Structure formats: structure tokens, C-alpha cells
Amino acid sequence: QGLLQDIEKRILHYKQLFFKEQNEIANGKRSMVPDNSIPICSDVTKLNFQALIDAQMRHAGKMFDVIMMDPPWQLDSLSDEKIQNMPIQSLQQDGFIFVWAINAKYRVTIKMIENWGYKLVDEITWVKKTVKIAKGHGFYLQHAKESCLIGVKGDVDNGRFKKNIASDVIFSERRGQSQKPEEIYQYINQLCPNGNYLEIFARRNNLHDNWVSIGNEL
Amino acid sequence: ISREEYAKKMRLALSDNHICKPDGTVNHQYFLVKKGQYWGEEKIQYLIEQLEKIGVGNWKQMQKGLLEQTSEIELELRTCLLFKTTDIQPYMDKKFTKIEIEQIAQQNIEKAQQLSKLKYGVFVV
Ligand SMILES: C[S@@+](CC[C@H](N)C(=O)[O-])C[C@H]1O[C@@H](n2cnc3c(N)ncnc32)[C@H](O)[C@@H]1O
């Protein structure tokens, strides 16, 4: 198909973009990650949850007002007991906790946030639009949504948490699955604006301003 | 906005050396490239320093020492950035010095300007 000059032409072309990007990177090119995300790459197996405690408490008299997670359940295979052992008691003193629960673990998570001492009160429901419905193989029913369980503990009667401000229904697409809708952080803002946030088991696409994101893929 | 210094301090307090720049601002350079393929500032020093004594074309010899991981074949590829030339086939197999590199650039970076053959900050052949 006469392509020695074809394959040699793409090489020097592809090398130019490297040469281009590797220059822009040196020209102060901005990545998409906002300038207030606090990304921490670690494995929650080996992390010191007193280094994150001692720091935040010092650089902010508060603790975390909202806690997110989307843990990975063995069905990158993190065991059920080792997630239950993450000291979430000491990271959060007063606020809410948002944890995403797939259907195989929907009951597991309710047990999970209760041993940590919270109190189930709500559940966000993220239905999937085709662009307006999802098809998911379930053993008993077709799955068309994922749930994000909401627990709470402490005094939320402060003005720090705007009550009656967000819904339980979300209508985003299946963007880059497994990725969660960005509308959650907007809801966490309407609930609790300008506050200390935490998102365990997060990725590049989860970084936001004021969000402390922990995840071994950052 | 005090969230800036709060974001500035907490990044300094806990983030890996790569993810956070010494001043404390987010260093996007690591975030722009996928995975842990970002070439550490230390790694660049390591390649500059490994390359001069070992020499170009010694990649089979080159991989074994300085870069603990198996480096991508790129060592040829990255070197071009140091030498400011799209085709290092002229410089290949010649062992160089750690100081010689920059002199090579200024001439080619100048030549490519009078040759109009300068793109992306590196002499294009
Ligand atoms: C199901 S995902 C959660 C993704 C998240 N929903 C998001 O916003 O995209 C699981 C992620 O947890 C992170 N992770 C996996 N194992 C981990 C571990 N053992 N310790 C810490 N983080 C881990 C990895 O990024 C993996 O990408």
C-alpha cells in the first residue's frame, strides 16, 4: 500500500505535538485541575490519618463538613473489612457524609456508615439519561440509577449547612464510567458553601476547589 | 479568599513532592500528563548526568542504571529536547559532556531561526 513515507510522516508529526506540549507545559500552560484542590496520592491501607488530622486542624480550626467516597468493592478490589476500618470517626466531627453504594453493596454501606456513628437520613438518586433511561443487568430488576447514601452526625443547626436546599434526583449522563456526576459537588455547595470538604477514593476528574481528594490514581 | 492559603498550606503539608511545586502552587505539569509518566525534575538531572558518561546510542546500557524503572525508549526521544534537534541521527552514538548540551542548543536554536525551520522551540529538520 506504499506506506514507508506514510509511517515516517506520522512519526515526525507525532513528535511535533510532544515538542509542542512539552513546550507549552514549560510556558505555564494550565491543566484542568483547579488551583485549590488538595490532591493526595496514597493508598488508604498505608496512609497516616493523623497527618491529615494534625494538618487540617491546624491550617483550619474546623474539621471536614462533608465527606465523600466511592469506595472500590471487591465483586481495585478493596476488602470489605479494610474499608470498615478507615478511621472516619476522627476525620469528621460535625457534618454530613456522602457515600456511593452499588446495589451489590447497598446494604453493606448502610451498616458501614452506622458503625462509624452516623444516622441515615437521605439518599441521592442518580438516574442515567440516554440523551432518558438506563439499561443495567440486575439479578432481579434492571438497574437504571446509582445511589449515594447520606449520613450525618453532630450539630447541623448552624448556618454552616443550608437546609432544604438540594433535591435527591440527578439527571446526568454516564460520563466516563465509572465516573460520578459533577452535579453532586454543586449540591454539596448548596448544602454547605465555602466549607472543608473531603473525598476519599477520588481520581483526577474529581478534583475541585477546597476538596481534599485521596486516591491512588492521582 | 483565605481558601487560597488554606489550599496552599494543605498541599505543602501532605501532597507528594511531584504533585505540589516547591512554592506551594499546584504544578499542572504532572496533572497534564496521564499516569505516573511525568519525568521528575530529578529524573531529568539523572538523564542529563547518565547520558554524558554513557553516551548516546547506549540505551541498552542506559536503562540499567539511572532510571530505576525501565525508561521508555524515549531516552532517545527526550534527549532531542536537550539537543534541540528533531533528528538526533547526526549526534547518535557520540558520547557527550554534561556541559556540551546547552551549547548544541543555542547554535541549532539560532540556526533554525535563520533557517526558518524552528517550531515548538526546537530545531526541526
Ligand atoms: C470505583 S473508583 C471510584 C471513582 C470515583 N467514583 C470517581 O469519582 O471517579 C475506585 C478508585 O479508587 C481508587 N483506589 C482504589 N484502590 C484504592 C486503594 N486501595 N486505596 C486508595 N485508593 C484506591 C482508585 O482510583 C480507583 O480508581
Task: Convert chain A into a string of H (helix), E (strand) and C (coil).
Answer: CCCHHHHHHHHHHHHHHHHHHHHHHHHCCCCCCCCCCEEECCCCCCCCCCHHHHHHHHHCCCCCCEEEECCCECCCCECHHHHHCCCHHHHCCCEEEEEEECHHHHHHHHHHHHHCCCEEEEEEEEEECCCCCCCCCCCCCCCCEEEEEEEEECCCCCCCCCCCCCCCEEEECCCCCCCCCCHHHHHHHHHCCCCCEEEECCCHHHCCCCEEEECCCC
* Alpha carbon distances (Å) from A201 to A34, A52, A69, A80: 18, 15, 6, 15
Distance CA B36, CA A218 (A): 9
**Long-range interactions of A7-15: CB distance < 8 A, separation 24+:** A12/B86, A15/B77, A15/B80, A15/B86
Examine residue A202 and state whether it is found in any structural domain, yes or no: yes
Count Cβ atoms within 10 A of the Cβ of residue A124 and give its class: 0-12 exposed, 13-18 middle, 19 or more buried.
Answer: buried
Q: Does residue A205 form part of some domain?
A: yes
Q: For atom 10 of ligand 1, which residue has the closest CA? A: A72
Distance between CA atoms of residues A115 and A93, nearest Å: 15
Rounded distance between C-alpha atoms, residue A62 and residue A160, angstroms:
11
Q: How many angstroms separate the CA atoms of A28 and A67, rounded?
A: 33
In a domain, residue A174? The reply is: yes
Q: What resolution in angstrom units was achieved for this structure? A: 3.7
Phi, psi of B6 (to 5 degrees): -60, -45
Q: Name the residue with cell 460520563.
A: A175
Closest residue (by CA) to atom 16 of ligand 1?
Answer: A76
| Determination technique for this entry | X-ray
β-pair type (B118-119, B122-123)? antiparallel
Q: What are the cell numbers at A194?
A: 465555602
Of B63, B40, B41, B39, give the one whose Cα is nearest residue B51.
Answer: B63
Cβ distance of A36 and B3 shorter than 8 Å: yes
Please check whether residue B123 is in contact with residue B108, taking contact to mean a CB–CB distance below 8 angstroms: yes
Number of structural domains in chain A: 1
Sequence-distant (6+) residues with CB within 8 A of A43 are: A216
Please give the C-alpha separations between residue A170 and each of A88, A125, A141, A181, A202, in angstroms, as whole numbers.
Answer: 27, 6, 20, 8, 20
| Interchain CB contact of A210 with B (< 8 Å) | yes
Residue A13 CB neighbours (<10 A): 9
Q: Quick check: B31 and A19 CB within 8 A? A: no
CATH number for position A152 = 3.40.50.150
- Show the domain range for A58: 39-218
The protein residue with its alpha carbon nearest to ligand 1, atom 18, reads A43
What is the C-alpha end-to-end distance of chain A, expressed in Å?
43
- Chain B residues lying within 8 Å of A204, measured CB to CB: 31
Taking the C-alpha atoms of residue A191 and residue A22, their distance in angstroms, rounded to an integer, is 41
Q: Is the CB of A213 under 6 A from ligand 1?
A: no
Instruction: Choose the mutation target among B1, B5, B8, B10 for the interface with A, i.e. most A CBs under 10 Å.
Output: B10
Residue A16 counted as domain residue: no
Q: Which amino acid type is present at position A130?
A: T
Task: Quickly list DSSP for B41-102.
Answer: HHHHHHHHHHHHHH-TT-HHHHHHSSSSSPPPTHHHHHHHHHHTBS--TTTTT----TTHHH
Burial of B91 (0-12, 13-18, 19+ CB in 10 A): middle
8 Å CB contact of B10 and A21: no
